[PDB]
Amino acid sequence: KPRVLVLTGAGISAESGIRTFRAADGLWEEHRVEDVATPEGFDRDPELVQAFYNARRRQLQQPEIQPNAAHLALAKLQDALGDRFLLVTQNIDNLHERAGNTNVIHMHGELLKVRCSQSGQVLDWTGDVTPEDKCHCCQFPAPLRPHVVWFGEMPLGMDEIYMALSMADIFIAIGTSGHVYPAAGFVHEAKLHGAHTVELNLEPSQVGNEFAEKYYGPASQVVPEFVEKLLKGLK
Amino acid sequence: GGAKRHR
Ligand SMILES: [Zn+2]
Numbered sequence: 001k002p003r004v005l006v007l008t009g010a011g012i013s014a015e016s017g018i019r020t021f022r023a024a025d026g027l028w029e030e031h032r033v034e035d036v037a038t039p040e041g042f043d044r045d046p047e048l049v050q051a052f053y054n055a056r057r058r059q060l061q062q063p064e065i066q067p068n069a070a071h072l073a074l075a076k077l078q079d080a081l082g083d084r085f086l087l088v089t090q091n092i093d094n095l096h097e098r099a100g101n102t103n104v105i106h107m108h109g110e111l112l113k114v115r116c117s118q119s120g121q122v123l124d125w126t127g128d129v130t131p132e133d134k135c136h137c138c139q140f141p142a143p144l145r146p147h148v149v150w151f152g153e154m155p156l157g158m159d160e161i162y163m164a165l166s167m168a169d170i171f172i173a174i175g176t177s178g179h180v181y182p183a184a185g186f187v188h189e190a191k192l193h194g195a196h197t198v199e200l201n202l203e204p205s206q207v208g209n210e211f212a213e214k215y216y217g218p219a220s221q222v223v224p225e226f227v228e229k230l231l232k233g234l235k
Numbered sequence: 236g237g238a239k240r241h242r
Contacts, residue, residue, distance in 0.1 A: 108239065151239050152240070155238075180241060182236050182239075
């Protein structure tokens with residue numbers, strides 16, 4: 001019955017063996033943000049950036065990488081709330097999909113998808129991206145880039161997200177750093193429209209002060225314990 | 236809204 005909007009960050013996929021920029025270093029897989037997550041870095045060294053996400057994409061599909069209990073808990077939450085549930089993620093992994101979630105809004109794109117340089121059309125891509133690859137949507141074909149939103153680019157599905165933010169009875173942010181905007185500002189927006197805000201995190205986010213309710217610790221145990229408590233709450 | 240940004 002209550003409308004629930006869930007925002008997830010890199011923290012929820014950390015226990016599954018997927019790492020992304022850390023606090024102390026400010027490095028992603030020992031790379032600078034600016035070199036692997038900007039339009040400029042891609043224009044400077046297309047070969048390196050393409051190879052970077054080639055590594056990330058094939059690491060994602062290793063047998064050792066599995067959705068953890070936090071991913072699974074959110075899947076059960078959708079089963080219970082039906083279409084009164086919306087999952088928005090900053091992650092480019094597919095662990096929400098593997099866990100059983102559907103209609104997940106990837107505001108920062110997906111690692112298992114690529115995009116045509118000029119057409120903007122999106123293609124499913126599981127293998128490596130090579131210089132020998134072009135599009136089949138244009139009469140004059142074009143180079144392929146990862147379908148990932150870089151810093152300086154516009155996030156995806158923003159219209160649908162803000163619409164859901166104003167409708168949500170309960171807003172839950174999971175594994176978010178609070179450093180990446182506009183995603184970190186979502187908790188604000190949710191409160192103006194009267195939503196109850198909850199933060200579930202291993203590391204308390206910088207905007208954690210904001211949230212009405214907080215719980216901290218490993219996601220695979222904090223998230224299921226909150227989801228299970230929310231489910232029994234609605235009987 | 237705006238574009239993806241840090242800080
Ligand atoms: Zn094309």
